[PDB]
Amino acid sequence: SIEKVPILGKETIHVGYGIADHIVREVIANLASSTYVIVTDTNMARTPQYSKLTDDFKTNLSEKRPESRLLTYCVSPGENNKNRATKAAVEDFLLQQGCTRDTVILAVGGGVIGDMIGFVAATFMRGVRVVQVPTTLLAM
Amino acid sequence: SIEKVPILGKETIHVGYGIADHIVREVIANLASSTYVIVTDTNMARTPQYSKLTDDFKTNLSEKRPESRLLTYCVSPGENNKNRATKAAVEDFLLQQGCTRDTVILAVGGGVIGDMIGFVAATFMRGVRVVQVPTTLLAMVDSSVGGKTAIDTPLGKNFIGAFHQPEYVFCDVSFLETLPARQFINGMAEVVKTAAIWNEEEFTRLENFSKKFLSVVTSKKPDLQSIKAELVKTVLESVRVKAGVVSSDAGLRNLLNFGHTIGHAIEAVLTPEALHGECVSIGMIKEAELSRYLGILPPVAVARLSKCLVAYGLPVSIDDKEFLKKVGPKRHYVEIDILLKKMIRCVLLEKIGKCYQLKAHQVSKQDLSFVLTDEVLVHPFTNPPKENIIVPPGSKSISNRALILAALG
Amino acid sequence: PHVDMEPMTDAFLTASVVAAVAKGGSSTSITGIANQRVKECNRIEAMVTELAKFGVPANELPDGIEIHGIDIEDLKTPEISKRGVSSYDDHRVAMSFSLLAGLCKEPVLILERSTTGKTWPGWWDILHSKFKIELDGYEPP
């Protein structure tokens, strides 16, 4: 149902078809935090499969951690939109939404999202945690 | 001629007065590269002392490595010139001058340069080497050592950055004759923050140092000859205190925020007219007040700690004789409600030179609301101690006599 | 009934605030305190105004003060009513009325707290740790 590939000694790459229950049951249970940010693409945001994931992240928070939030960003997709100005947008979105040094930034996107949002998490508050949820076969 | 302070197991912090030969002879010999970048301030670029350094970096590379370059940038000064746009200028200057993952970026500057250029080197080509050459007394003891780098988002000061350790931090003490007296006293706050959380012997010398350090700095040209040896000693036990803690790691590094809780809220409203050591000095006495409030600190400690700060000219309270002139009409932006919510752990001081249980304790808002004001609200007595000894100030009458008699006996 | 203080003049404000809660038919009429005006101010008139702000009568005698005592508790005149306890920046007035202030229901504010730095700069510090009592602070805009 799920294969698991070790990286740097820890078994954190989770592989499987239709694992939408296991996406939400693993990060709010093992990686405890207060603010959870889901940054994605806008054409990915209108997809029906993304509504299966966030609504399973919404309603499954109230049973495991009711005093925790859920913020959502939507950056227009494209290499032209992966630049130092649209990096500054979520670099401004997190700071004016009241985010701290414990954010979990779920970068549900492709290669343009996992390159940019991971660089934000490498610079936001001197390093915060990131959960890559890649979607294209190249970025997987 | 040169002292050397270990950091993270390597002896890379080099301290000494007039070490301009040793700056250039150490980085091109031990840290071999192809491109060498010297980023600095423009008002620092016109200084005569900076021409002693770069021209000793120019002509000494044709001896030691003739197939290597020298690029130079000059960012304009100011607090507002440390931001994500002027970071992008040297982030564009390096890429269009043909730089690679081999660069040595000498950040000859102050705290605004070592915060920004070190963040560039934390991001340029996914991490390159940086040699901090700090110039102001604040940056020699605070921001160079540690590798804490960030820039100024308009929504928040010192929030977006990365952790990147320097390769060499040179404490070039001869770069202090061009410093203004206001910026120079502002660094002597953070030598007291290091000489009052970990050291006590240094603090005893500082009171003997506070006399003629002030007569030589307030004189508008600060003739620093014949006092080189105690000035270089002053920054020694500020970094040794610091690098003794940054090697120990977030655990024990939170002891270096003694005063950086109250002094960051006073900085938060009085930002662009009151400096950083100006408000930490107020936050020192206000946190020495809170530790005295919880029965931890002896009351002779605040009488000595507020003596050393007021001898240096740093403020001891927010309504003090020089701090009112500098801040001016911004003084009335200091209310108890806005200060308190943006502060809550505190470094509770046990005595001068020691911390209480070597950790950071969480105090309530009510005692933090108490120590900042000259207004007391007394609650109904619900539970005094039934056994309670109370020692008032010792009898001055017998004391004065006892010292005379003892001296004669 | 009546106590004279020729050498114990720097004890009057302490004696007055405990006489403020001593109730009975005879009232505490302390005298021989004429030198207490020229310290910093007329503190004889101070006890008249402030003890009226606690609700206990304190008239002015020609060489001292006659102090009543109503109960162990007093009348209810907090910072919500008029003004609080003026200290006139003297250490004697602040530390004396702090003993009296903890007997009401609501907390009694005392203006000008940190003027006790002449004699005991850490009185309020002793009151919380070493006497187990709360203390807050207030700032009028």
From Swiss-Prot, chain B:
It is found in: Cytoplasm. 7-phospho-2-dehydro-3-deoxy-D-arabino-heptonate binds at residues 126, 142, 148, 158, 190-193, 242, 253-257, 260, 276. The AROM polypeptide catalyzes 5 consecutive enzymatic reactions in prechorismate polyaromatic amino acid biosynthesis. The active site is at H264 (proton acceptor). Transmembrane segments: none annotated. Zn(2+) binds at E190, H260, H276. Disulfide bonds: none annotated. The lineage of its organism: Eukaryota, Fungi, Dikarya, Ascomycota, Saccharomycotina. Residues 1-365 are annotated as: 3-dehydroquinate synthase. NAD(+) binds at residues 41-43, 79-82, 110-112, 115, 135-136, 157, 175-178, 186. In the N-terminal section; belongs to the sugar phosphate cyclases superfamily. Dehydroquinate synthase family. This is Pentafunctional AROM polypeptide. It comes from the Eukaryota. It comes from Candida albicans (strain SC5314 / ATCC MYA-2876). Homodimer.
